Amino acid sequence: VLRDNIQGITKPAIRRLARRGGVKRISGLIYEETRGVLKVFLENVIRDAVTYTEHAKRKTVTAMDVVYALKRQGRTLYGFGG
Amino acid sequence: RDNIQGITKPAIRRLARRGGVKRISGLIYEETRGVLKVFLENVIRDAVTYTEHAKRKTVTAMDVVYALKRQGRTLYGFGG
Amino acid sequence: HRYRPGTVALREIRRYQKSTELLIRKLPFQRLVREIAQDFKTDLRFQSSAVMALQEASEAYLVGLFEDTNLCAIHAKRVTIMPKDIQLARRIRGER
Amino acid sequence: PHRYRPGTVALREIRRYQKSTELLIRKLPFQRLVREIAQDFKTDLRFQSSAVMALQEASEAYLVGLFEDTNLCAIHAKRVTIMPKDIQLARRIRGE
Amino acid sequence: RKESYAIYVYKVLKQVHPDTGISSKAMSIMNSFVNDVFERIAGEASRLAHYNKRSTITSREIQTAVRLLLPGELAKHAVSEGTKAVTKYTSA
Amino acid sequence: RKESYAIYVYKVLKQVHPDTGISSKAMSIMNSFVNDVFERIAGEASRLAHYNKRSTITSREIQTAVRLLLPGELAKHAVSEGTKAVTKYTSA
Amino acid sequence: RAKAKTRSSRAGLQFPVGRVHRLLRKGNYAERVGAGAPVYLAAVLEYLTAEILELAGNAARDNKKTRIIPRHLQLAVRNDEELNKLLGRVTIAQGGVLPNIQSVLLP
Amino acid sequence: RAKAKTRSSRAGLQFPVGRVHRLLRKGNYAERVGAGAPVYLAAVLEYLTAEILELAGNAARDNKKTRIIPRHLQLAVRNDEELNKLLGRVTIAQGGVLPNIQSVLLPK
DNA sequence: TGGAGAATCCCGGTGCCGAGGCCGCTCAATTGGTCGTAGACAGCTCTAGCACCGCTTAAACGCACGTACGCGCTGTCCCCCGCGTTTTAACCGCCAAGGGGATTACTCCCTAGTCTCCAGGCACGTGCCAGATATATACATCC
DNA sequence: GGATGTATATATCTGCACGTGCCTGGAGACTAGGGAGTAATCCCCTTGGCGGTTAAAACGCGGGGGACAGCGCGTACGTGCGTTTAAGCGGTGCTAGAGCTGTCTACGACCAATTGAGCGGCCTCGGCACCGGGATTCTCCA
């Protein structure tokens, strides 16, 4: 049972992702909000990926399931088949 | 020609009062007219394409409903 | 007498959010629709339901955009909306 | 000794991480997070490597776009520092 | 002879709100709502059949489309109502 | 086994940039682009055929799907090569 | 031939199973349509229509009216979180907007 | 019989007309598929492929590279307005972002 | 404004692994003929859309006061950036088990297709109940 | 404490729901064939483990800069009132053209034989990642 892996998305990783977004200065309460946003987004994609897995009667979540889940939410991903 | 001025200042004021705006700048109205012109140009162009595909000269409500559904602005109540 | 600046605005907010009626006059919007459609095909006809559908969609879109504009004005510690708030709302929405 | 002014290393990092295409989150904690999230839906579940890679690419792109909108919201409030209210404003204008 | 869901939404409305009527524009809205939800669920089931190399739409595909489309409690109750419907249809 | 637009986009690349190659990931992304645009145009043409009570997808359906989906200059040019290719196919 | 019992009656439904089956068959969704798919789909549509009509009837009785108008449907959809999530990109004609005023605008 | 001339060869195309035709038949789009529809669709797809590939080759040449990587495809799509409008809700994997530092963040 | 330390840009050498080309084959595109039906075209009709007129009246428009409020300036102090050192776990290489995804054979039940037939659903018609309107009183806000 | 917007209550009038005849589409009943379930197999590939190493995260500390609160000021919308104007409602009329029906014919589905283009497998070489050293910005402080 995996517990408390949201702290693995570290403050330097969120700082790097803000650097790619063009952010010069970052507050200290940004990281908890970014972790919550990431958890909500990953829950939304992973629920549809698991649903696509369970419809195919498989025990593995394939990349094409994640591509279908992301194409569902208008976030189509290029490079993992389709 | 020059029919964008028919969307008057109190019309934009009423539209913002329905949106909850308490105070409105004087440069809001030309910006809102440009926004409305862009939106109407997109929907009317798509509806005209849907009309001329059917070889008709009358823009139906069905064409406007499909033009809005193409852009993710689905409208209920006009035959959809 | 004279009312304070803001109370008639709040009364209008409470009035127009309680109603469903179209806030744009019908004939100027119809003339604007026929002026815009003239660039795409010459000598077009329109059903009345088409112009009514266009007016309902345009009014809903403008009301939602003014709600986001009001959020953008409040975020900059203002109660007055400005064109930069409209531009920021359309930028975050993906329309610009 | 030598100490740079506050902001120069930030702009150098902005140029460095905008010129590059590497994933900015470590792969093993993201993988553990994906298993922890997916264990709440179906237990005893496996993942392809390309599935976790697709999830990482999508999550990083979504967070980078969100931070761009957050930076726009921070600039709109006459600031250079991003705050959680900017994230909340960007997410409500997007409609999430 | 245009077909619509007018008498059925009449029947559901009188089944749950007996002393309550409905207007013509409201029924145009409800007909558009039923058509839109039908198109969403049928399109998601068509995609689900095409992804799994299947040429039929069964109760499993429409159930998965309901789980993908509807939010949590709505999806749970729609799954429960439809499973009750399929079991009653097969039992009768 | 698996089918993809691998050799064709390479042929187009050597037609356009004869001294420029491609990687495998860029190949998969271009294949995904062709598949997604094909799905968009074919779905729009299917919807256009269903709206006008037609059971046939013709070149007119693809033409108005390109006009609906692609932006302005892209749509005008793509209509031009589509019409040119259909004219060359019918004439020979 | 025996008595013609409809597929909606033997499933305990009000929406037509046969019409949903016909629109599934000619809608070009799949090459085949199973027996339980129109039954399941008509049950789901009947449930969603019932939920909308419950909340719209409550909104109509809140406004002291016994006839459901589009404003009542709009209040019904947007006052529930799941129905607002399902109908987020949907504009209801003659529905208006809900009364919301931000707290910084109050005196 | 005659020589088996490819439908793409008599249409002046590089994309396969027959594969677009089988994908239109088996994709559940209509009961009937016309003869000129796959020719039109293959021409449109080939034009869009060439439009992305020309700009991606230009972006690869501007970065002193021979082969095309997903960074060059991302730069080609995002630097063209019509391609960014077409591909706006699509993430290119290993593509990165455009270099864009805001004017109020630069020092004076 | 000059100069020191840090960082960035640029050129030559080395290896590696992934792109690019060649070959066998196989399955899927092509070719040729047949057939049924979808759609193109012609005719008609009657429906709704456009064009104009008159009035009356609500709403748009111009203008004046003035007050709140957007915006610029100043202080302060706390919070976050930069850098150094320690810790920790990510990452790479490798090595095994073993679940499970992918393929093949078969076999059966499930669904397309068709003929018949009757009952549900739709268009038409009507009459009656639910809101819209108008006016006086008191409740609720406003300054 | 006085002055206005607005529930609240009563009459009144007009523009959704029930009934019915036709009709057409769903249902009963039967056949045929092929799509998917099920069992078996096998081999990719996913997970779990160990160890070294080293890169990145975490903690601490100094300091500076920017977020935030306060304050003045000048101006630009809010509000109100009189004037103008054209939206809107009702009416008339006329012709485009949307929509339905009928006929015929071209065209796409379908089937069978043929054959060649594309895909898997394999081999090899050059584009490029990396490293090291020097030339050129480049930022900050005297």
Numbering used by the authors:
A (entry chain B): 21 to 102
B (entry chain F): 23 to 102
C (entry chain E): 39 to 134
D (entry chain A): 38 to 133
E (entry chain D), F (entry chain H): 30 to 121
G (entry chain C): 11 to 117
H (entry chain G): 11 to 118
Give the text the authors published on this PDB structure.
To our surprise, the NCP–55I is still capable of forming a stable complex with AAG, as shown in the glycerol density gradient experiment. One is the structure of NCP–55I determined at 2.8 Å, and the other is an unusual NCP structure at 2.9 Å resolution, with the terminal nucleosomal DNA highly flexible, unresolved in the map (from SHL-5 to the proximal end). Similarly, a global perturbation of nucleosomal DNA by DI in NCP–55I was observed, but the proximal end of the DNA displays a much larger displacement. The buried surface area between the DNA and the histone core decreases from 7517 Å2 to 6745 Å2 in the presence of DI at –55. Locally at –60 to –50 (–55 ± 5 positions), the –55 DI-induced structural displacements of DNA backbone are 1.1 Å and 1.3 Å for the damaged and undamaged strands, respectively, which are in a similar range to those observed in the NCP–30I, NCP–50I and NCP–53I complexes. Altogether, the presence of a DI in a completely buried position also leads to a global perturbation of the nucleosomal DNA. When the damaged base is near the exit end of the nucleosomal DNA, the perturbation could increase the possibility of terminal DNA duplex opening to facilitate AAG engagement.
The engagement of a DNA glycosylase with a damaged DNA base marks the initiation of base excision repair. Here, we report cryo-electron microscopy structures of nucleosomes bearing a deoxyinosine (DI) in various geometric positions and structures of them in complex with the DNA glycosylase AAG. The apo nucleosome structures show that the presence of a DI alone perturbs nucleosomal DNA globally, leading to a general weakening of the interface between DNA and the histone core and greater flexibility for the exit/entry of the nucleosomal DNA. Mechanistically, local distortion augmentation, translation/rotational register shift and partial opening of the nucleosome are employed by AAG to cope with substrate sites in fully exposed, occluded and completely buried positions, respectively.
